[PDB]
Amino acid sequence: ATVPDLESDSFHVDWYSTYAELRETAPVTPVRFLGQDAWLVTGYDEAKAALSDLRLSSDPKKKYPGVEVEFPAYLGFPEDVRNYFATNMGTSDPPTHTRLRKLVSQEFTVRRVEAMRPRVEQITAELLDEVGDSGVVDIVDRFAHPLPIKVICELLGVDEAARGAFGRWSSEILVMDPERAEQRGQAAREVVNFILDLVERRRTEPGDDLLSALISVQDDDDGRLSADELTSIALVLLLAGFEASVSLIGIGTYLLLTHPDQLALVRADPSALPNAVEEILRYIAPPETTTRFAAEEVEIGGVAIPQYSTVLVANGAANRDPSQFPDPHRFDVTRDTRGHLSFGQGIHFCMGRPLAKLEGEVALRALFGRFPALSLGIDADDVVWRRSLLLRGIDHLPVRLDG
Numbered sequence: 454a455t456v457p458d459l460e461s462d463s464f465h466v467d468w469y470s471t472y473a474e475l476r477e478t479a480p481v482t483p484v485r486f487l488g489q490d491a492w493l494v495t496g497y498d499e500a501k502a503a504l505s506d507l508r509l510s511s512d513p514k515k516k517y518p519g520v521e522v523e524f525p526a527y528l529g530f531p532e533d534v535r536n537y538f539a540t541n542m543g544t545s546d547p548p549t550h551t552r553l554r555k556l557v558s559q560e561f562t563v564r565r566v567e568a569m570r571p572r573v574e575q576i577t578a579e580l581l582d583e584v585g586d587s588g589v590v591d592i593v594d595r596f597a598h599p600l601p602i603k604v605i606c607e608l609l610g611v612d613e614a615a616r617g618a619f620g621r622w623s624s625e626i627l628v629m630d631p632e633r634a635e636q637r638g639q640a641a642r643e644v645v646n647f648i649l650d651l652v653e654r655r656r657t658e659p660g661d662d663l664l665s666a667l668i669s670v671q672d673d674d675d676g677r678l679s680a681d682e683l684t685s686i687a688l689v690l691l692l693a694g695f696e697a698s699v700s701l702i703g704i705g706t707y708l709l710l711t712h713p714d715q716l717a718l719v720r721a722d723p724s725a726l727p728n729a730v731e732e733i734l735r736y737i738a739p740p741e742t743t744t745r746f747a748a749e750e751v752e753i754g755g756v757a758i759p760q761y762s763t764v765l766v767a768n769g770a771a772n773r774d775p776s777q778f779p780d781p782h783r784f785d786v787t788r789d790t791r792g793h794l795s796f797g798q799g800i801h802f803c804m805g806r807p808l809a810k811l812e813g814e815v816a817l818r819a820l821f822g823r824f825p826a827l828s829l830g831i832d833a834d835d836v837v838w839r840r841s842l843l844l845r846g847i848d849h850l851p852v853r854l855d856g
């Protein structure tokens with residue numbers, strides 16, 4: 454037959470049309486990606502079922518007989534650094550996942566996030582102060598990007614002389630291009646080194662930050678985080694703590710700008726903003742694809758996925774399933790967004806949801822309330838989308854502030 458290769462332009466040029474075509478044909482279809490055979494789940498029910506099925510592991514460190522487990526997101530990562538990226542809750546299965554998440558939840562709380570609101574609002578104001586009030590500016594470089602980074606650095610205790618650097622590393626890690634596999638693996642080692650230093654200096658000079666707190670956190674029945682776990686969790690909190698938020702702000706800005714009717718709605722009714730954020734995530738999900746490994750044979754949507762298969766749950770395609778979201782291709786800030794899979798589903802549900810919504814709301818509100826004449830500086834069709842199934846986004850978005 455003819456198997457699709459996720460590396461083709463069909464998955465990067467009007468891709469939601471390609472997911473649509475695949476879905477109606479087969480909601481669970483075999484594909485080729487990065488040289489391996491995998492299974493792409495495009496249907497809503499099938500995707501939701503797969504995330505809820507624990508036979509589909511999240512752990513890339515598990516060893517099986519005559520099997521070489523290879524998650525495409527670790528393309529080019531040496532084993533030592535791979536292990537540093539994969540010893541946290543998102544790369545663990547129960548009961549390991551259970552205690553890891555339990556320990557972290559004790560400190561990464563809603564109270565701590567809420568206590569950050571005035572700071573987030575303060576940082577937003579400042580960045581907007583610096584862009585001016587006329588002409589064209591790169592809203593990503595000048596706003597969408599710095600904001601989440603400054604917020605996460607304060608939450609984690611990352612000081613001035615450290616920030617920015619990781620910015621360039623993370624960019625490399627976001628794309629999975631076999632040609633640049635060694636550069637990708639190189640950037641990965643850089644972040645691992647940076648984190649090792651961060652953690653060490655934090656053990657020596659403790660503060661009020663989340664990292665310090667996770668260092669002394671302990672539970673009577675679950676004990677505490679080991680050095681490796683602490684190091685890996687710190688690493689993922691830093692990276693996952695800002696990247697997806699950059700995508701939310703930037704994609705969100707592009708969408709409101711391109712949907713005047715929807716933007717006006719938000720301007721008129723600020724209470725319609727929280728749901729606009731949820732509709733932004735549903736419309737174009739940043740984590741377009743999440744990976745799972747079939748430890749056992751699993752039947753999804755009538756299809757029997759062979760044991761030891763790599764399954765790619767297309768969260769983004771699922772959010773566009775007609776049977777779940779009527780007229781899914783219509784960006785509507787007023788629609789019911791309940792059930793979208795952008796924050797996950799099941800035991801690995803997004804822990805940072807509270808912070809992500811806070812950032813998206815505060816940021817978009819400020820941006821648009823500050824520049825009532827804001828518009829795109831390029832034709833909508835010219836916007837360049839990040840070519841990644843791992844974390845979709847816009848790296849350059851020129852806007853005109855005054856009009």
Ligand code: HEM
Nearest residue numbers: 542543694697698701740795796797800801803804805809
């Ligand atoms: C727009 C924002 C965000 C989106 C779209 C997003 C999306 C997701 C998704 C899809 C998952 C599930 C992964 C899976 O099933 O394998 C997840 C997990 C997670 N997210 Fe978020 N996330 C966002 C922001 C954040 C932030 C701000 C933080 C941290 C401060 C965060 C921390 C995490 C963590 C640690 C997990 C793993 C939880 C677990 O494995 O049990 N996320 N996120």
Ligand SMILES: CC[C@H]1OC(=O)[C@H](C)[C@@H](O)[C@H](C)[C@@H](O)[C@@H](C)C[C@@H](C)C(=O)[C@H](C)[C@@H](O)[C@H]1C
Nearest residue numbers: 526542543544626689692693696697740843844
């Ligand atoms: C290099 C692979 C890793 O990617 C990243 O850290 C990316 C920079 C993040 O943006 C990812 C995509 C997040 O936004 C969340 C969706 C998932 C995250 C919290 C995980 O737990 C997950 C295991 C993740 O660490 C890996 C996919």
